[PDB]
Design a protein around this ligand. Sequence first.
Ligand SMILES: *C(=O)CCCC[C@@H]1SC[C@@H]2NC(=O)N[C@@H]21
Length: 80
Amino acid sequence: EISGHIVRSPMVGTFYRTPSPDAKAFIEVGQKVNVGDTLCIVEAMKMMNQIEADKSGTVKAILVESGQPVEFDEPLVVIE
Ligand SMILES: *C(=O)CCCC[C@@H]1SC[C@@H]2NC(=O)N[C@@H]21
């Protein structure tokens, strides 16, 4: 059985769950995202790699661990 969809970081940077401290937190666990919705930023050299969920579904968890540097092909967020 498939485990949904997993999003692996395309490059290296810095994962996160809550951008601008004065925000509403990005797509965290138990969250709902639809093809066309935001996801999160990578923060690679100040590029704001703000990804946008394009597979719809409900986030299951994160393996990259926000606040931690990102690496090529890193499960940023796994959707259910
Ligand atoms: C880049 O100019 C310096 C670091 C910027 C950090 C960014 S702002 C939105 C995210 N939230 C946070 O705490 N850090 C990320």
